[PDB]
């Protein structure tokens, strides 16, 4: 029915209502150091997030998504492999059920406990809908996280996600400042990709951070209290909401960093 991360509409079954599953650039893939190559001719990132205005968290039933307003140029990303500006319209997270496994990106086959994902579409495309109909429509911001000690800035994330524990469910979710999950560190690796989840469009320049956050063990623990399923519904526990590394084909991983 219809796509989730369960035994019978996970990941592998995907390709069936979403034939570009198996394209050229899908994502996520595993990072190479080793083979990726440095290029000095990326400029260093430019996130520009002082005046970001977030409006609500909800539970999509695959992750959690806390929107922004997008209607001006409040937070944006400019720089790096980017040409023009493109504004946060959301983020979200995957995680796993054990600290061993979460993430989608892994790093010489390393898997994180988590990963951020921040969402942003080209402003020269009008809005989100069109943005996703071109090959540099959206840059997603990847970050990874591991387990040990707490990260002030997410916490007021972790507080809210029992008001969301369910499908559908949505919270008022202002104020929230994006800055504070950031690394200290802007060095990065970029390749040209995909979405993760259906649609799974090949629209997406993606910019993986170097450096993970790290997070404490309870705050990760309440992502896995969330439900995939609606209120009323049998519960099945929001774990291991992430795809699997996809064959990186022909394309090439960038670093800003040597
Ligand atoms: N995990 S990730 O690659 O960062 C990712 C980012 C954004 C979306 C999204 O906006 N989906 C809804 C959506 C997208 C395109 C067209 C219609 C939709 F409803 C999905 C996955
Ligand atoms: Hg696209
Ligand atoms: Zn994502």
Sequence with gaps: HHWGYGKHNGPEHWHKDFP????????????????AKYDPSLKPLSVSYDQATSLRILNNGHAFNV??????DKA?????????TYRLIQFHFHWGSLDGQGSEH???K?????????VHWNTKYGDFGKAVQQPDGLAVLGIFLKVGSAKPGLQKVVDVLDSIKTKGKSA????????????????????????????LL????????KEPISVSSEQVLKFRKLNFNGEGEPEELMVDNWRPAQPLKNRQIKASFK
């Design 110 to 118: 390393k898997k994180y406990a988590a990963e951020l994902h921040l």
């Design 76 to 84: 944006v990303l400019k720089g790096g492999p980017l040409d023009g």
């Design 172 to 199: 008022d979710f202002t104020n929230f400042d994006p800055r504070g999950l950031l690394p200290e560190s802007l060095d990065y690796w970029t390749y040209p990709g995909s979405l993760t989840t259906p649609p």
């Design 106 to 108: 892994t790093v010489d």
């Design 20 to 35: 570009i599953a198996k394209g050229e650039r899908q994502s996520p893939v595993d990072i190479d150091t080793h083979t």
């Design 67 to 72: 929107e922004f307003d997008d209607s001006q």
């Design 202 to 209: 090949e629209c997406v320049t993606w910019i993986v951070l």
